[PDB]
Amino acid sequence: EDNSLSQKKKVTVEDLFSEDFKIHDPEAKWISDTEFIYREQKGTVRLWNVETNTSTVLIEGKKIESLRAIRYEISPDREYALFSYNVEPIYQHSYTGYYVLSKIPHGDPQSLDPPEVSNAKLQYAGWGPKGQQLIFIFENNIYYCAHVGKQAIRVVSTGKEGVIYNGLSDWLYEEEILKTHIAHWWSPDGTRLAYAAINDSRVPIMELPTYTGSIYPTVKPYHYPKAGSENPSISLHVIGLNGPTHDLEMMPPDDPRMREYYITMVKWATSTKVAVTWLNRAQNVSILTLCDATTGVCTKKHEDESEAWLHRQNEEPVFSKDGRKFFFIRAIPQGGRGKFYHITVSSSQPNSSNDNIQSITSGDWDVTKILAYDEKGNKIYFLSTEDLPRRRQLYSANTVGNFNRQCLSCDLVENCTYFSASFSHSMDFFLLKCEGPGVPMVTVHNTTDKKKMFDLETNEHVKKAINDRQMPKVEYRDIEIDDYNLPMQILKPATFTDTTHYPLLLVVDGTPGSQSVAEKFEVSWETVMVSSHGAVVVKCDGRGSGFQGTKLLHEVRRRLGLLEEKDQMEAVRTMLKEQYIDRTRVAVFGKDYGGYLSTYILPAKGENQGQTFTCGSALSPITDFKLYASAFSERYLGLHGLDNRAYEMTKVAHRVSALEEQQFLIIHPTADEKIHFQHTAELITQLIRGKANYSLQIYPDESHYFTSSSLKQHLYRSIINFFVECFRI
Amino acid sequence: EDNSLSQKKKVTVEDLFSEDFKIHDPEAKWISDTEFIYREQKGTVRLWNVETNTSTVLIEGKKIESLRAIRYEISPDREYALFSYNVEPIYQHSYTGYYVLSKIPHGDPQSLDPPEVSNAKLQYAGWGPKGQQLIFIFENNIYYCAHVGKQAIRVVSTGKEGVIYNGLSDWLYEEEILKTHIAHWWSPDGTRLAYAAINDSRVPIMELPTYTGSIYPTVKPYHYPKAGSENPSISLHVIGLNGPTHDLEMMPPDDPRMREYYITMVKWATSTKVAVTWLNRAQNVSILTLCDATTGVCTKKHEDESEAWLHRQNEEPVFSKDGRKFFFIRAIPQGGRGKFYHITVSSSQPNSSNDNIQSITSGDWDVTKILAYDEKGNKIYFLSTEDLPRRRQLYSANTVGNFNRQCLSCDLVENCTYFSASFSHSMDFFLLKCEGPGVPMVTVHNTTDKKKMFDLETNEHVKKAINDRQMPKVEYRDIEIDDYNLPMQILKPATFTDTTHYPLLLVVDGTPGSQSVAEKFEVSWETVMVSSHGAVVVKCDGRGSGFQGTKLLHEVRRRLGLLEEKDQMEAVRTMLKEQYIDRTRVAVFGKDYGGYLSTYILPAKGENQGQTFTCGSALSPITDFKLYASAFSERYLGLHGLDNRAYEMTKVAHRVSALEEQQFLIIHPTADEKIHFQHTAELITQLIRGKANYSLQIYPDESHYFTSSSLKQHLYRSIINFFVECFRI
């Protein structure tokens, strides 16, 4: 007999925004092989020279005075830096606002401004590879300044506001393919810049309604392609930083299946050579091409094509110091059960006669990314799910014929399993972060000794908070269906008892090409609810989850809805067969694409066990893929315009007809830029036709990602305050 | 052993939309001294005479096969019939559609057409007063045809789509002040037409979002002058039906405080002289003016003004056949409690030295509208509130010094005790209709014998249905605060039991010049919920409502909402003393302006007696009157643009701040043009900042007047479903 009270306060709503839980990552980047940038720890920014415990104050409590410049970065000369803050701060991935130049010693603000124009907003500044040369993007125009005090030079200015995007990515590139906003890349020599110019005039335009703006609010118009519409028309240009600065346009290939090209990847192969990944409009035919920036001569080095589509076309080709044989990562057949994503080798100049396909790694697992390759001998470092899909571990292999894989850390202090590392220019030291399943562990390590030769950032306060609050028990119960094994992640409220029945939630994302069951450390509304309300949560990554086989990924190609619905529902079936789960209170949640799923999965099982969930909800739930971005629609459903009959069954209406007793809900901001309000509007219309019971909460004229702490706090509060009633008996 | 069965079934929403409760009112109109239209009640169109039960079917039941024309009007010569079908209403009265002309007996339907154009949608056609002459308004252009066989001829075409209106009303001149879409007047002889030209060029424009139209739904722009904006430029023009049809325009007076004006009332004095009412922008000066058509010159007749505002702007004076003294209705002091609305005599040509004002009526009551004046006698027939403000009865005063208002209707029927009458050209024969609280009756009568020859429509189905189900018993309970009187209405399902407790739902409308506590028979969601769900619903006409004193109207100048809030909370506190009613379950409802009330009456009384309303709700509420039409904001809260500071204290936002835990609902269609959705969006923003629980529903791209049955039943089902789980414990 024992009691074991363990009376510690349950996690409240504010805990996610409590400074104790305010996880800090310096996000160090190797300035050289002997030191890293060592950004803000708790204020001043030092330069912790990794050689021998030496820290030099490069930045001090001075950016606090400069109107709280959110972002900061120092030029390669380490002598003049740029600070940047925001006025009317919009950054979902936008990152606009004010830029300022400043001095390395201290103080000295300097408004980096467009020529002939005073202090004004700037899109992006960045740094060059050499000395203090910088650029800045004003109203879709790239201007360059080799010297900090040098008068601005209009390198290119033909870009137009919302019409021509050169030096920055438009919304489709900012959200669907590049997933990054910067569309310029410096050459290795710091003399040339390769950028992308996008014409958007032919692109169809939508207008987001506005209410809260003014007494006569007007719609914000911008281009937003859809299925069967006109995609942005991109071109690739190269312009020098000095002298003539000639613009050179690179010719894409003219294959019969190469109708329209997406620039999924472009990188300087050398100071004059460049490697570009060009994908067909159907997103099922990719071509890796090697071109010459100063010459413009293009020649293909590889080509791949898949029946369904190509995944992770954002490959990063890591090159040698002189354009010698380099590395790549791609899907090799790997026999049965999916052409797994493994590493591959390319020679310096692969002849058109044959390819250099050389799987450095082989096995039923995938490499998430290639970390780095260093030329003294044979060392490729990378992150992979080799040990387990739900974990990202560090691995190293050798480029010489031995091809021997090797772990580096394989667990460290306080239960760390998840890994993510980053090497320097010359292997001298590499950073490593845990971010799971414990507190993130910012650390330095040395390639030879492989030892933590000083603690970088541990966040002991986070451990104190996690031991001072009822952090819910983490559990795993891998499931298996048909010809695949599906991960899972059930949670228990740390006061659980097998005798006491407890309610259940299913959290679903199911994004095609991503994963939800990961050992990354995270605290969100689910953690609070399992703490504040004590309901188990289920995270099942059904068919189409990433890093689990290309065949599994393509299982849902043009077959959305049903398969993932089957997986999530069968996860619910598996959870109900226990004695600690009461059928009275079982709920679901979703968001973004998962919102779709969060709506698609409310049918009746059998006849006695109908109305599978008492309550459900969604957030920004995509419902019609015709009304969503073309780069996404055509990817998983093919090109429109020819009536492919791949959209009628995709509409969630077909499933929402029943809605017998489920207490549904929708939360959707008015001014959503990713998933338009039209999706919620159509769903509500269909619901009205079906005459169902639901409630709606709205955010008037707000962005999609909730980049305001008040917005996120209110959102999590609303979700909790919604599940409380339907989980109360 | 067998007692068989008893008891009658209660009332459910399905009953409302069953055919049983439909009030098939024919709405007959006195064509001549001894005949009325006797329009459709259960099919065919039949003409009747008062002499001896004369039956004359003019049109068969062919409207069903005539594409189910929504409306029809016979030609004034009783020779042609105009059918209106395929109507797509946009406002309350903008029934744009298709018009087809046909011969009186039957056969040969002919589609009215614009010149040189085939069948197309028509804004309005109408009929003339004599012969077969007609007009029609197409794309804001008035064309006329004296001869039906004669094709369309151009008459006036200055109109522009949404900018220039000829003979019709814009939104402001349809819904706020003129309260109808009729802006054209036929001369008694059918020789000239008087039409209003509305210029919207300087009127600001607002877009209403569309969320359902197509792949890229676009906003709808229309001219909605907000508070502190420029009202449309209205001019009056008289045109001839023959010859050159040279236009002549009316010249308004030029008092220094009436430059910006509304033509709030204009009625033909004769076939060439007219009386027109100009109400200035501050609506504090209303000049009645006599104009001659052939010269275009307007001669001033009289002026009216008040310490707060003018009222009853569309009471058309009745001009005698000789143009002698017309008996208009103006605010005479009538002792205390403000200047009651009593009849004023005005001679044909009153001397400028002194007018011929004469208070025909008198008493602690007023006249709602004046039917006619028997030129062959000292009899003037009208409808007035002589008995009670909540009942209207027919009366006949003496235009000469007799001044005897006779007891004609005056409770001549046992049940309704509430009346509405309409006389002929000779006023010998008149139609009478009860319209509550009993089942409405339509009856013929003569003013000589005051005898009921036969009932025109008895609503037999309505009577049997009102006897079928357990009706809610009607009750009344006057209240008084200070020197103000306020009626009240309350219902019970008539199967009330004192032991069982029932909750209270408070319904408010509260708009100036209205009467929520009325003895009108009606079937709605209120009685359905009272019957089936067992609740008692209270209506209390607070301060600011009309028909009970010009002072009791005008005291709310710039203080619109607070006084009626005090009246309603007094009603709550003085009604919750019942031993069969409880403080736990108290709920409120609101609509349009009442939504503000439904939100403005939820504080926490003191500190202990909080939780005033358990589950409140509202429809299209208004919180910031700046975002609303100037003709309502300025008219009661003071003119906008001057920062009256009533536009910063009449916001319920600071009032809805507390709302600590009370659940609340909002319902608002997307395409609302009564109270723009911006009000709801701002309210939601405040609530998110206020951090209070709320719910919401949406109707995408739906007008405010609920022009469909399915939408109406969905709304009623949704509101009753909201209330049913918010009452039961």
Q: A713: helix, coil or strand?
A: helix
**Do B147 and B244 reside in the same domain of the chain?**
yes
- B487: CB partners within 8 A, 6+ apart: B389, B390, B476, B477, B478, B479, B517, B540, B541
Q: CA B389, B393, B396, B397: dihedral to nearest 10 degrees? A: -10
Q: Taking a C-beta distance cutoff of 8 angstroms, is the pair B211, B670 a contact?
A: yes
Cis-peptide, bond into residue A188, ω within 30° of zero: no
Q: CA A692, A698, A700, A703: dihedral to nearest 10 degrees? A: -120
The CA-CA-CA angle for residues A85, A91, A95, to 5°, reads 55
CA dist B42 → A494, B25, B29, B54, B83 (Å): 72, 9, 17, 18, 17
Indicate the pairing of strand B615-616 with strand B581-589.
parallel
Closest C-alpha to A230, from A180, A181, A280, A281: A281
Question: How many angstroms away from the CA of A678 is the closest CA of chain B?
Answer: 5
For the CA atoms of chain B, what is the radius of gyration?
Answer: 27
What is the stated resolution of the deposited model, in angstroms?
4.0
B467 to chain A, any CB pair closer than 8 A? The answer is: no
What is the residue whose two structure tokens read 């920014």?
A45
Determine whether the interchain pair A670/B681 forms a contact, defined as Cβ–Cβ distance below 8 Å. Answer: yes
Indicate the pairing of strand B502-507 with strand B581-589.
parallel
How many Å apart are CA A359 and CA A343, to the nearest integer?
5
Contacts 24+ apart (CB under 8 A), B47-54: B47/B78, B50/B429, B50/B444, B50/B446, B50/B453, B53/B453, B53/B454
B216 to chain A, any CB pair closer than 8 A? The answer is: yes
How many Å apart are CA B542 and CA B546, to the nearest integer?
10
- Which residues in chain B have their CB less than 8 angstroms from residue A641's CB? none
Closest C-alpha to B278, from B318, B234, B322: B234
Task: Give me A516's structure tokens.
Answer: 């939800």
**Do A77 and A21 reside in the same domain of the chain?**
yes
How many Å apart are CA A607 and CA A586, to the nearest integer?
17
Q: Taking a C-beta distance cutoff of 8 angstroms, is the pair A526, A537 a contact?
A: yes
B212 to chain A, any CB pair closer than 8 A? The answer is: yes
A72 to chain B, any CB pair closer than 8 A? The answer is: no
Q: Taking a C-beta distance cutoff of 8 angstroms, is the pair B557, B309 a contact?
A: yes
Dump the DSSP string for B290-354: EEETTTTEEEEEEEEE-SS----TT------TTS--EEEEEE---SSSS--EEEEEE-SS--TT-
Determine whether the interchain pair B682/A211 forms a contact, defined as Cβ–Cβ distance below 8 Å. Answer: yes
Q: Which of B204, B215, B678 sits opposite A627 (nearest CB)?
A: B215
Determine whether the interchain pair B204/A216 forms a contact, defined as Cβ–Cβ distance below 8 Å. Answer: yes
Determine whether the interchain pair B212/A688 forms a contact, defined as Cβ–Cβ distance below 8 Å. Answer: no
Question: How many angstroms away from the CA of A288 is the closest CA of chain B?
Answer: 35
Determine whether the interchain pair B218/A207 forms a contact, defined as Cβ–Cβ distance below 8 Å. Answer: yes
**Do A394 and A528 reside in the same domain of the chain?**
no
Phi and psi angles of residue B714, each rounded to the nearest 5 degrees, phi first: -65, -40
For the CA atoms of chain A, what is the radius of gyration?
Answer: 26
Q: Taking a C-beta distance cutoff of 8 angstroms, is the pair B669, B708 a contact?
A: no
Indicate the pairing of strand B663-664 with strand B615-616.
parallel
A709 to chain B, any CB pair closer than 8 A? The answer is: no
Give the type of residue at B722.
F
A residues 581-640 closer than 8 Å to B (CB): 626-627
Determine whether the interchain pair A206/B216 forms a contact, defined as Cβ–Cβ distance below 8 Å. Answer: yes
**Do A368 and A476 reside in the same domain of the chain?**
no
Q: Taking a C-beta distance cutoff of 8 angstroms, is the pair B74, B104 a contact?
A: yes
CA dist B340 → A544, B311, B381 (Å): 77, 11, 19
Determine whether the interchain pair B693/A721 forms a contact, defined as Cβ–Cβ distance below 8 Å. Answer: yes
A326 to chain B, any CB pair closer than 8 A? The answer is: no
Dump the DSSP string for A44-95: SEEEEETTTTEEEEEE-TTTTTTT--SEEEE-TTSSEEEEEE-SS--TTTT-
Number of domains in chain B: 2
**Do A503 and A546 reside in the same domain of the chain?**
yes
Select from B17, B215, B224 the residue whose CB has the most chain A CBs within 10 Å, as the one to mutate to test that interface.
B215
A164 to chain B, any CB pair closer than 8 A? The answer is: no
Which method, experimentally, gave rise to this model?
Answer: cryo-EM
How many Å apart are CA A728 and CA A710, to the nearest integer?
27
| Chain centroid to CA A304 | 24
**Do A484 and A592 reside in the same domain of the chain?**
yes
Cis-peptide, bond into residue B437, ω within 30° of zero: yes
- B606: CB partners within 8 A, 6+ apart: none
**Do A441 and A480 reside in the same domain of the chain?**
no
Give the type of residue at B297.
V
**Do A413 and A532 reside in the same domain of the chain?**
no
**Do A177 and A98 reside in the same domain of the chain?**
yes
Give the type of residue at B145.
C
Closest C-alpha to B268, from B290, B299, B241: B290
Determine whether the interchain pair B699/A677 forms a contact, defined as Cβ–Cβ distance below 8 Å. Answer: no
Closest C-alpha to B560, from B310, B308, B368: B308
Q: A587: helix, coil or strand?
A: strand
Closest C-alpha to A586, from A503, A501, A693: A503
Phi and psi angles of residue B288, each rounded to the nearest 5 degrees, phi first: -90, 130
Task: Give me B620's structure tokens.
Answer: 């299209």
Q: Taking a C-beta distance cutoff of 8 angstroms, is the pair B338, B307 a contact?
A: no
- Which residues in chain B have their CB less than 8 angstroms from residue A215's CB? 226, 626-627
Q: Taking a C-beta distance cutoff of 8 angstroms, is the pair B388, B397 a contact?
A: no
Select from A685, A689, A726 the residue whose CB has the most chain B CBs within 10 Å, as the one to mutate to test that interface.
A685
How many Å apart are CA A699 and CA A612, to the nearest integer?
29
How many Å apart are CA A578 and CA A557, to the nearest integer?
34
**Do A409 and A518 reside in the same domain of the chain?**
no
CA dist B562 → A331, A464, A646, B477, B599 (Å): 71, 53, 58, 22, 12
| Chain centroid to CA B151 | 36
Q: Taking a C-beta distance cutoff of 8 angstroms, is the pair A32, A78 a contact?
A: no
- B586: CB partners within 8 A, 6+ apart: B503, B504, B506, B572, B576, B611, B612, B613, B614
Q: B18: helix, coil or strand?
A: coil
Question: How many angstroms away from the CA of A213 is the closest CA of chain B?
Answer: 9
Helix (H) or strand (E) holding A164: strand A164-166
**Do A393 and A539 reside in the same domain of the chain?**
no
Give the type of residue at B694.
Y
**Do B485 and B460 reside in the same domain of the chain?**
no
Residue-range definition of the domain harbouring residue A85: 1-470
Residues in chain B: 729
Select from A13, A207, A668, A720 the residue whose CB has the most chain B CBs within 10 Å, as the one to mutate to test that interface.
A207
What is the residue whose two structure tokens read 């929402």?
A656
Phi and psi angles of residue A723, each rounded to the nearest 5 degrees, phi first: -70, -15
| Chain centroid to CA A541 | 18
| Chain centroid to CA B369 | 13
How many Å apart are CA B142 and CA B153, to the nearest integer?
9
